[PDB]
Amino acid sequence: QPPKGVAVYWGQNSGGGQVRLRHTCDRDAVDTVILSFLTSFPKMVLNFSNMCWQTFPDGLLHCKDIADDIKYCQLKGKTVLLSLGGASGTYGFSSDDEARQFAQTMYDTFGPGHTAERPFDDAVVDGYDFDMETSGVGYVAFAQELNRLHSHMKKFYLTAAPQCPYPDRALGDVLSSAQMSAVYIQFYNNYCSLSGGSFNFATDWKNYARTVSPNKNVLLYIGLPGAPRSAGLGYVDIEQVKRVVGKDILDDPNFGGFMLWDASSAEANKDAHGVSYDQQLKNYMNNPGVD
């Protein structure tokens, strides 16, 4: 469902010099931007790091500049998702019922519905990304209800960002039980990075897409660190990416492209030609070369 190419997270400022969302959507290297994050739910807390400090009277972030940049990104043909969780998230449901209600909350707060306090006002995100790194109750009920509620929009995407070890303990049930538009696999901070010697995109995850995923058209993205500073381990130079991501992968029907943690990080990390890491990857996908 989503555009193949390069997907970047934005909001948490891995680089250090993160600027407005609009700047990222001006880059031809980028096709999908993922707002990081709704760090808590169903008691909602937003956190965009250095980019939104105003609130509504109840403490919820009110992000006028991001709202404008969402509309602007969409106008530039980019897909904009909102991501839930993150490693520093505090989140969980007490039941499937609580999970189903909160889907409605999401429809009304961030989606096409209405409510008094919308952090992005009239801007409407194209979809949600599950980035819970811990196991919890009601994830499958949550995913399904979001799909049902949002199934009348023109473009709606439900994605998740499991880590590379298969099965993913946090999100495996969602991944096996719900219709996923795309999966941004984190090949970092674990043994199955691109550098470790145990890269598992073409084994476990390809198997996932072919025999497990409810949605047979699911796009799998290779999630990479944007810079050495964006993970404990897993960062690879483009030469290393090329060695391990060959024609077999690049030409797979279920290969979506590359995810990056994150935009600020990928942009600042430049090669000797002054080309940024997101662009290197894009250039690679467009003109793989031969080997």
The domain that holds 98 is classified in CATH as 3.20.20.80
Residue at 291 is within a domain: no
CB 158 within 8 A of CB 135: no
- In whole angstroms, give the CA distance from residue 6 to residue 32: 7
Query: Token pair 């194209």 is at which residue?
Result: 126
Instruction: Report whether 20 belongs to an annotated binding site.
Output: yes
Q: How far apart are CA 248 and CA 271, in angstroms?
A: 26
Query: Helix, strand or coil for residue 222?
Result: strand
What are the counts of helices (DSSP H) followed by strands (DSSP E) for the chain?
10, 10
**Which segments within 126-198 are labelled E, that is strand?**
127-131, 157-160, 182-186
Ordered alpha helix ranges (H), 150-233: 172-177, 206-211
Take residue 228 and report the two structure tokens written for it.
Answer: 């050495």
Q: Residue 40 sits in which domain range?
A: 5-286
Q: Any idea which residues carry the catalytic annotation?
A: 133
At 272, give phi and psi (nearest 5°): -60, -30
Q: 122: Cβ–Cβ under 8 A, 6 or more apart, which residues?
A: 67, 71
Resolution (A): 2.5
Say if residue 190 carries a ligand binding annotation. Answer: no
Query: 32 in helix, strand or coil?
Result: strand
Query: Is 278 one of the annotated binding-site residues?
Result: no
User: Whose CA is closest to 131, among 194, 167, 79, 174?
Assistant: 174
Q: How far apart are CA 127 and CA 62, in angstroms?
A: 19
Bridge-based pairing of strands 32-41 and 45-46 is: antiparallel
Q: Which residues pair with 129 in a beta bridge?
A: 83, 159
Q: Which residue has the tokens 């709202």?
A: 67
Longest dimension (CA), the chain: 57
Q: Based on the structure, what is the number of domains in the chain? A: 1
Paired sense of beta strands 79-85 and 127-131, if any: parallel
Q: Could you tell me if residue 149 is inside a domain?
A: yes
- Burial environment of residue 110 by CB neighbours within 10 A (0 to 12, 13 to 18, 19 or more): buried
Q: Residue 273 CB: number of other CB atoms within 10 A?
A: 7
Residue 6: beta bridge partners? 258
Residue tagged 């961030």 (tokens): 110
